[PDB]
Amino acid sequence: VQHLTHRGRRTYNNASNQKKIRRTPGNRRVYIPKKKPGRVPKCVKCRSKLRGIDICRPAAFARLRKSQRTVARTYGGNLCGSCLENRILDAFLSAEEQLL
Partner RNA sequence: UGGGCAGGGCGAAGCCCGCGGAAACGCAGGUGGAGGCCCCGAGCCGUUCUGACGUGCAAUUCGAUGGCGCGACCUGGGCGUA
Partner RNA sequence: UAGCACACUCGGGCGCGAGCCCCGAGGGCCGGGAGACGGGUUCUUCCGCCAGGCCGCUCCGCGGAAGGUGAGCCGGGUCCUAAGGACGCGCUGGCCCGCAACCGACAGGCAAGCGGGCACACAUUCCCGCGCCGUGUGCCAUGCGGCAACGCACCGUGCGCGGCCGGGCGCAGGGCUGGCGCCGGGGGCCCUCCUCCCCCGGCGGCCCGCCUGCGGACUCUUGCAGCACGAGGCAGCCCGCGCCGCCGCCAGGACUCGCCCCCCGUGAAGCCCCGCGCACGCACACACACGCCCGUACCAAUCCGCACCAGGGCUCCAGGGCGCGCACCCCACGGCCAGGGCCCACGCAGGUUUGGGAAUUCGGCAAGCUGGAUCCGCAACCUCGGGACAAGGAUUGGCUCCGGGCGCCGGAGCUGUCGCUUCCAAGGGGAAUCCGACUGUUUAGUAAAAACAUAGCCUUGCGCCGCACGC
Partner RNA sequence: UCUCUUAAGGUAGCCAAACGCCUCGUCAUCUAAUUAGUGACGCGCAUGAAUGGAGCAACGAGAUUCCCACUGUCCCUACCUGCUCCCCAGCGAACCCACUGCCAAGGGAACGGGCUUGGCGCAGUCAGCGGGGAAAGAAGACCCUGUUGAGCUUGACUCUAGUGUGGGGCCGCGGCCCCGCUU
Partner RNA sequence: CCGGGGACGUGUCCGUUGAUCAAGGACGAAGGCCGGAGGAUCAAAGAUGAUUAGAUACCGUCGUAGUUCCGGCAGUAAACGAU
3-state secondary structure of 69: coil
43, 50, 53, 56: which one binds Zn ion (CB under 5 A): 43
43 binds, among Zn ion, Mg ion, RNA, none (CB under 5 to 8 A by kind): Zn ion
Using CB under 7 A, count the residues that bind RNA.
72
Which stretch, 14-22, 26-34, 40-48, 60-68, contacts Zn ion (CB under 5 A)? Answer: 40-48
Any contact of residue 38 with Mg ion (CB under 5 A)?
Answer: no
Any contact of residue 29 with RNA (CB under 7 A)?
Answer: yes
Rg of the chain over CA atoms, in angstroms?
23
3-state secondary structure of 28: strand
90 binds, among Zn ion, RNA, Mg ion, none (CB under 5 to 8 A by kind): none
- Phi-psi map region of 40: left, alpha, beta (phi>0 left; psi -120 to 50 alpha): beta
3-state secondary structure of 39: coil
